[PDB]
Amino acid sequence: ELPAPVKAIEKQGITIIKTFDAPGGMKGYLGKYQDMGVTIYLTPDGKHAISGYMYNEKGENLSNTLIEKEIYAPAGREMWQRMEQSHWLLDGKKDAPVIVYVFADPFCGPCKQFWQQARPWVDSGKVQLRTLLVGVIKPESPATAAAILASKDPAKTWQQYEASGGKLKLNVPANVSTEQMKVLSDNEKLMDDLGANVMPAIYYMSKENTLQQAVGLPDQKTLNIIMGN
Amino acid sequence: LPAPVKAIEKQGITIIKTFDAPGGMKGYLGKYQDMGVTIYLTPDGKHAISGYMYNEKGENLSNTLIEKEIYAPAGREMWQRMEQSHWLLDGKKDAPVIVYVFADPFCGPCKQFWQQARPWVDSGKVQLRTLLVGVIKPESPATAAAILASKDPAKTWQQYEASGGKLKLNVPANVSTEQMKVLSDNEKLMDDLGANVMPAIYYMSKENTLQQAVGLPDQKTLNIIMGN
Structure with a gap:
């Protein structure tokens, strides 16, 4: 033809x-x-x-x-919307101009290091992190993630958990509730579609409105790019 | 570093x-x-x-x-959304190569593609899964709905494409609510995929990455779509 x-x-x-x-x-x-x-x-x-x-x-x-x-853009817009519609936990100001999604597990060491790296931008109102919790690394990852989702203020409990290096004591319930089990199951299904099993799995939008990813603890250049510098 | x-x-x-x-x-x-x-x-x-x-x-x-x-991750969610839609089967349900196509009853190039595909569909290597939309002509919605309303919609669609759109249909008094939902869902997915020209063809590479072809494929693209 x-x-x-x-x-x-x-x-x-x-x-x-x-x-x-x-x-x-x-x-x-x-x-x-x-x-x-x-x-x-x-x-x-x-x-x-x-x-x-x-x-x-x-x-x-x-x-x-x-x-x-x-x-590239159509698949990226769809994944961005799917993360937007998930049950994520807010870290930072709801009006922060830069939005960053992160898959994280309670027993992920690198997740807590990235949480520390983000503080200067989060604590200044420039970036909000939206965490999609999963329970996949360790045997007690599901229950520990469920315990923080079950708390009265889950987003604050997650901040305490990361800031304390996981030393924060929790009330763990007798079982994962059906609502908590759904959140975790959906979040891992979105994680699987995105192709990263190593955490933190970090997703952010380029200036060209294409979806970009970082996996593991970012270096200085990648961190600065994630955070909108 | x-x-x-x-x-x-x-x-x-x-x-x-x-x-x-x-x-x-x-x-x-x-x-x-x-x-x-x-x-x-x-x-x-x-x-x-x-x-x-x-x-x-x-x-x-x-x-x-x-x-x-x-590349493989970007495709998966769109692929499953097509799988979960109300598509029409053309070929063997166990054919190893799956090809989705967004089509309109009044799309000329869609019928040419349907003809091109016959050797692979008839062999049992490829199944075409058609996601009907009703967007081209004023009568596209009613005609697509008439095909969805027929006794064997997948067979009516094949006869319709094979006939160049000359196949006569029983037109119902209106589009039913389920048919309207099918057409509207398919059009919104097609929009999300970013191609409005038809046929809009979606298929998986040997590397399990999602691929697209828009319009009537040339010979090389056709062979690739069909899994050669």
């Missing part, structure tokens, strides 16, 4: 997703190479095609913009 | 996580713009290599890892 120059580019290992309208009398083709988006532009003469990246007068990489909006 | 890795960070790489690599090497998974990157710290601890690691059998382990950690 494809113009010959585009078929030649196909043979270099590119699979075509869709056509699109491009500037300057050029027809666009969006494709993938090993799951990375690629853009191809058919020239006006119709007898040549260019595989590469298009830039505009303002210096914007329009090919990256298009690949982000058409390939 | 080890100094050679910090130098690579300054080239525009944001690190996601560490991982274990062969031979006393530590791995770092990262991104450059939209691109997944692997970095390997040398045993001496004083050098790092940004690139792709291969094993004796010739597998690109960096690509395997980048696919599993960065």
Whole structure:
């Protein structure tokens, strides 16, 4: 179905997703190479095609913009909304401009270190952390997570738990209640879909409104990026 | 962070996580713009290599890892949402290759794709699972609902596509509430997937990552959709 120059580019290992309208009398083709988006532009003469990246007068990489909006953004918007709708615990001001979701377990050492790393931004009102608790690392992870979900102020209990390094004493109930069992079960199902079993599993949005991830304790550059610097 | 890795960070790489690599090497998974990157710290601890690691059998382990950690997760939730929808089966229920397609009764390219798929569907290798929507023409909703309302909706849809839309239908007095829900749910999922042109085709790669094709596929894309 494809113009010959585009078929030649196909043979270099590119699979075509869709056509699109491009500037300057050029027809666009969006494709993938090993799951990375690629853009191809058919020239006006119709007898040549260019595989590469298009830039505009303002210096914007329009090919990256298009690949982000058409390939990556839809799955990211959906995961972001799913986390938004889950039972997360608030850490920081409800009006903090930067939102960060974190999967955490009570017996995760690195989760508490990341909790400490976040304090300067959280305690200044810049970032809110939204924790999705799971109970998967240790045998008592489910009950311990359930005990904090059961407390009168779960979000405050979680802060005390992380700040104290897990030394905070709890009243653990006779069993995980059906409501608490649902929260934990849903949170691990969202964690599984996201592909990280190591914690903290940190999710945040790029300036391009694409979902980004950090797993384990971030280094200084990744931390500063997560926190919106 | 080890100094050679910090130098690579300054080239525009944001690190996601560490991982274990062969031979006393530590791995770092990262991104450059939209691109997944692997970095390997040398045993001496004083050098790092940004690139792709291969094993004796010739597998690109960096690509395997980048696919599993960065790309495979993005697809799963959309895939299950399509599975849970009210799709119509075209082919064997046990066919190993599953292909979802958003389609409208008045989409011309959808019927051409339906024809292209016949060799794989008829062989039992591929099942097409059609998510009907009613968006193209004023009569698209009523016609899609009529097909959902038929005695054997999956068979009516196949006959409808095979006939180029000439198949005559029994039209009901209105769209039922369940049919209306099916059409509305399918249209909202299609919107979330970001493609409004049809056929909008969704399928899984050999690497278990979600892929999309929009419009009538060319020969190479068709072979890939069908699992060749």
